[PDB]
Amino acid sequence: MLKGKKAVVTGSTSGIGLAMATELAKAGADVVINGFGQPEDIERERSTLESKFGVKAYYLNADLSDAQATRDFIAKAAEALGGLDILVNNAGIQHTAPIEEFPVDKWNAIIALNLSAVFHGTAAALPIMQKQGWGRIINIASAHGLVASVNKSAYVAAKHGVVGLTKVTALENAGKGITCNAICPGWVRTPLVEKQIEAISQQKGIDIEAAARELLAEKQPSLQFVTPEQLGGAAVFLSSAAADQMTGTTLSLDGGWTAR
Amino acid sequence: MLKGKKAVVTGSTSGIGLAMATELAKAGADVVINGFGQPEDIERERSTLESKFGVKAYYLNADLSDAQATRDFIAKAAEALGGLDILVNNAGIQHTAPIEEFPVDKWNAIIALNLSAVFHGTAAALPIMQKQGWGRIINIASAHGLVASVNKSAYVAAKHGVVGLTKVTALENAGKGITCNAICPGWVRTPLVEKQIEAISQQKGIDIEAAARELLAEKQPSLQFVTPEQLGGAAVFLSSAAADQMTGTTLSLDGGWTAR
Amino acid sequence: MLKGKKAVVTGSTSGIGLAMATELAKAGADVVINGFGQPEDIERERSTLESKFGVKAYYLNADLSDAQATRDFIAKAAEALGGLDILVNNAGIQHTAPIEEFPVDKWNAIIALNLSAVFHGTAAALPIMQKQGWGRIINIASAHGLVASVNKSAYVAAKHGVVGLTKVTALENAGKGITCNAICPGWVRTPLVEKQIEAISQQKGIDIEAAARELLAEKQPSLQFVTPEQLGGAAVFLSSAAADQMTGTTLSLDGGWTAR
Amino acid sequence: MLKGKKAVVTGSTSGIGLAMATELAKAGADVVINGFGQPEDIERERSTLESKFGVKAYYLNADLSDAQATRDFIAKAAEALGGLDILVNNAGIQHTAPIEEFPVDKWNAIIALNLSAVFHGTAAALPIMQKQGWGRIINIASAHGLVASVNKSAYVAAKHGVVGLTKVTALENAGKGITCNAICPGWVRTPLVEKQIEAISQQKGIDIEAAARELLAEKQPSLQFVTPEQLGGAAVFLSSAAADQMTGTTLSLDGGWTAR
Ligand SMILES: NC(=O)c1ccc[n+]([C@@H]2O[C@H](COP(=O)([O-])OP(=O)(O)OC[C@H]3O[C@@H](n4cnc5c(N)ncnc54)[C@H](O)[C@@H]3O)[C@@H](O)[C@H]2O)c1
Ligand SMILES: NC(=O)c1ccc[n+]([C@@H]2O[C@H](COP(=O)([O-])OP(=O)(O)OC[C@H]3O[C@@H](n4cnc5c(N)ncnc54)[C@H](O)[C@@H]3O)[C@@H](O)[C@H]2O)c1
Ligand SMILES: NC(=O)c1ccc[n+]([C@@H]2O[C@H](COP(=O)([O-])OP(=O)(O)OC[C@H]3O[C@@H](n4cnc5c(N)ncnc54)[C@H](O)[C@@H]3O)[C@@H](O)[C@H]2O)c1
Ligand SMILES: NC(=O)c1ccc[n+]([C@@H]2O[C@H](COP(=O)([O-])OP(=O)(O)OC[C@H]3O[C@@H](n4cnc5c(N)ncnc54)[C@H](O)[C@@H]3O)[C@@H](O)[C@H]2O)c1
Ligand code: NA
Ligand code: NA
Secondary structure, three states: OOOOOEEEEOOOOOHHHHHHHHHHHHOOOEEEEOOOOOHHHHHHHHHHHHHHHOOOEEEOOOOOOOHHHHHHHHHHHHHHHOOOOEEEEOOOOOOOEOHHHOOHHHHHHHHHHHHHHHHHHHHHHHHHHHHHOOEEEEEEOOHHHOOOOOOEHHHHHHHHHHHHHHHHHHHHOOOOOEEEEEEEEOOEOOHHHHHHHHHHHHHHOOOHHHHHHHHHHHHOOOOOOEOHHHHHHHHHHHOOHHHOOOOOOEEEEOOOHHHO | OOOOOEEEEOOOOOHHHHHHHHHHHHOOOEEEEOOOOOHHHHHHHHHHHHHHHOOOEEEOOOOOOOHHHHHHHHHHHHHHHOOOOEEEEOOOOOOOEOHHHOOHHHHHHHHHHHHHHHHHHHHHHHHHHHHHOOEEEEEEOOHHHOOOOOOEHHHHHHHHHHHHHHHHHHHHOOOOOEEEEEEEEOOEOOHHHHHHHHHHHHHHOOOHHHHHHHHHHHHOOOOOOEOHHHHHHHHHHHOOHHHOOOOOOEEEEOOOHHHO | OOOOOEEEEOOOOOHHHHHHHHHHHHOOOEEEEOOOOOHHHHHHHHHHHHHHHOOOEEEOOOOOOOHHHHHHHHHHHHHHHOOOOEEEEOOOOOOOEOHHHOOHHHHHHHHHHHHHHHHHHHHHHHHHHHHHOOEEEEEEOOHHHOOOOOOEHHHHHHHHHHHHHHHHHHHHOOOOOEEEEEEEEOOEOOHHHHHHHHHHHHHHOOOHHHHHHHHHHHHOOOOOOEOHHHHHHHHHHHOOHHHOOOOOOEEEEOOOHHHO | OOOOOEEEEOOOOOHHHHHHHHHHHHOOOEEEEOOOOOHHHHHHHHHHHHHHHOOOEEEOOOOOOOHHHHHHHHHHHHHHHOOOOEEEEOOOOOOOEOHHHOOHHHHHHHHHHHHHHHHHHHHHHHHHHHHHOOEEEEEEOOHHHOOOOOOEHHHHHHHHHHHHHHHHHHHHOOOOOEEEEEEEEOOEOOHHHHHHHHHHHHHHOOOHHHHHHHHHHHHOOOOOOEOHHHHHHHHHHHOOHHHOOOOOOEEEEOOOHHHO
16 A cells, blocks of 8 residues: 555546556545546546545646646646655557558657657656655556557557666666656557447448457457556555565466467 | 465475565465475474464475476475465576586476476466466565576576566466465575675675675666565565466566666 | 669768678679768768778658658658668667656657657558568667666667567567567667766776777676677678577677576 | 688578578579478579579588587588588477467477477587687567567467577677677568468458458558568578677568567
């Protein structure tokens, strides 16, 4: 547990990030959440963190595709929390197309959010962590940080970048009480994946649940989705003392994707 | 936690394996321990598992360099425990020499224990796990399962083998409720490493603690040893529900060794 | 050999790229070269390709940190050559600083050139290669595409990105007669590295050649630099028929860096 | 080219090894071949190396699953050739079964040949290479040296072991003029694979060529087999000066297998 700890999760209004936020609050951390969505939904999430788990929670809206906005977000988060012990760099987007058709503006958007925001958020968080001699940076990469699939040039590039950046962060901070690791999930049935399921379903002329099975069968040997709650549990483990010497590495929760 | 669970740890009379056993018993598992040592020491360890943690504990002596003895060990362990939910394949040895000088009998001994015993123990455990639709196989590999160092041909080969075998085990059992993963530690200050520290100390004409620092500085960016307790905590995480879709992968606790 | 082939090498006015260009021309390819430098030097290089090797050579100035300029460069290159069989994405820059001090504009410049230019150049080249059913895309990544070092966040990220992008390119084009691979060199004594050598020399108060030895000793077990000519030979091999089923992979020429 | 060079290829009476031998002889090396088969066939192969390529060729029968026989084989090979510049450790076997059914004697046979023979052959060859300050050790691993498939526990373990051993060999010999690398092929249509094709064909009730397509489609994105001649060309490249700083690494010729 994490009582007393101060955590920030990017892209935590929904999906994996919301589950990360929830598991951290359940472990006793105060939490800054972030991301887009309907204002009434975001506020109900923020207030639920506080009323279920007895922590402080803050929502800071920032579009993390802008470098300065990300750096300012971290400073505001730290001010809200009174410190910053755990940063989860989670916000991300996807777009599928073959390379020769891949929109330039989608390349730029995915690099900006999925890769550069991790750099700017880390850069802003590190001096706070270095001053207190304790920190956790948890980057949400992907199985696509280690291997590739067709039609995902920007995302694969970005996620491979995140894995590299994680290593660098870990080595620069080696021995300082700060670790940096990349969680690399396989398929998790959030809206980011439901769109891909829907696309397969129209391509193949099949019901959505058949399409979900086809999506799994191609990549994920277990034939089951990874859950956001599992991922939250992994982030809680990374934040624990057992993981004090776990740094610069990848934690794959991928149902076997990368074993073959 | 693991209340009700039945665990076997090979090479658990001392070192990392003893800490694994201890963390599993603390989480509520009954435990079979194994390995060499003074009989009075081994019995005090066995009885301490029971009296501190309120579990059942058994010591089964088996030299796991013999295939049949390993397979018979698993059967006896399962009979003692009334089942087998978690197998930790930990027992291992080391010998350093350059390849052209590496004793053939040391090659054979390290392959037999560090690689083949993992295969024979898994083979014996799997049908039990397959019948109950739940299992954890946790192989203790090394950073030397992913990268190399000089003078460790047999050990590096073996540990790379263990990582491959882990993948295979995971894929054959994908979706059955059984996962298989390899913990890959960096330096942990057990007697296996203290011998290497002593060897450096004589080579360099320096005190043991200087030698320990030199051993770390060459490989492990954090400049701190991984602890057996950290490793036990990782094994407990691998046994948890959060790790239900973690299979076929490596969990590096290595102070940054593999990041560079 | 490559008689008849049409090759483009980015960042080929000096360094590794010039050697790539030279080895390709020696194998009989016509070559488009690119990059910055003194106009008289660039023209002597262009004319030397033609007069020593009896090929056609063209210099096209393009700043490949601009997406549209890269895409237009490829189109102009193809028009000059009358086709495009081999693309070597080589141009790159470096900047060293720890993350919290790393200039934002240097992050952006290194991502733009070292990662995004590979994407835009590939995207423009692919349809030409797809129409003729033969192509080679050769991306110059680095040992820093697979592992990290301190103070190189942007470059490591970018080069890891290039390795991911290489995979994607290879899978999208699998079986079409087009391969895509990443050459991953260790240290090569170009001006990009001589600046780092000079920096070590001032930090340590030592002569340049001592500093060059220290730079090698830390990373590169062979204690010798990789040469640009070796790299050119690797690119020629990748362009050969023996490499028709070599695709989506990395070719490390790194003196052992990534083995440990 | 390799005029003057002295090469040994294990398991070169047929398959990949025969093609390796042939490409080396074509490049001008004298060659020792090895392996099982009909005596009239083996002698026609030996004499053909000499009469087509104008080199000396020798057949030495040794069962390389025996350590001493392997070490004695190398000594006899060196005596026949008058030296030993290039060793290709190629001989291997396969057996498919799930782990719990995998015969113990097949585990032992595959570890002995596919892993331990590489160690014993390297150990015997190294002192010869160290004395002349030049050598090439080329280990034939597999895509199964980097990733896994079901029902191939022993082979995957062994091939992962070979990749580890390759690294160690390279680091111990770093800077001595000796390199060690692992070629990692995907599917190559030799008798080792034709048996697996036949097995699929009976499982699925389909013609052999359909079965060959299914075998490729599952693993190898290019949908085409790697050829033995391609592999021979890779071994010739590894033996060249361009590869003087290529050491401790893997060269994947796998049609994209490991990119996804
Ligand atoms: N779903 C999966 O299968 C899967 C697998 C591996 C990795 N991932 C990664 O997990 C992360 C979360 O994915 P998800 O599936 O939960 O997606 P999601 O689409 O469900 O959630 C994305 C979150 O990011 C926020 N966000 C989007 N653009 C933003 C911006 N510019 N600035 C700030 N916040 C922004 C969204 O509002 C939301 O909170 C992403 O990095 C994704 O790449 C997902
Ligand atoms: N110490 C480290 O730095 C380190 C790092 C990474 C991986 N490892 C691995 O962790 C495992 C445990 O190592 P350790 O450092 O605790 O070593 P250790 O020498 O302290 O303990 C080895 C244990 O194995 C037992 N054992 C030895 N031979 C056996 C045999 N033939 N049959 C049954 N049991 C036998 C010993 O009695 C003891 O219980 C080994 O697999 C080792 O490779 C260790
Ligand atoms: N030198 C090494 O040790 C080493 C090792 C591994 C990988 N690399 C990579 O090899 C590649 C070449 O490096 P190098 O050492 O030859 O460097 P270099 O500095 O000697 O040459 C860089 C080349 O890129 C050109 N270039 C720079 N900015 C450009 C721009 N915006 N547009 C177009 N061209 C531009 C330069 O004019 C020059 O031709 C880079 O991608 C580098 O990352 C180098
Ligand atoms: N065929 C493939 O798809 C493929 C792919 C990747 C790696 N490999 C590896 O390539 C190597 C050659 O495989 P192949 O497909 O050519 O197989 P093969 O069965 O066609 O040839 C095997 C060769 O090894 C010899 N051999 C077998 N047992 C031996 C022993 N005990 N001692 C000495 N020689 C012995 C055989 O006589 C023959 O010369 C093996 O290491 C295999 O693992 C093959
Ligand atoms: Na893979
Ligand atoms: Na490494």
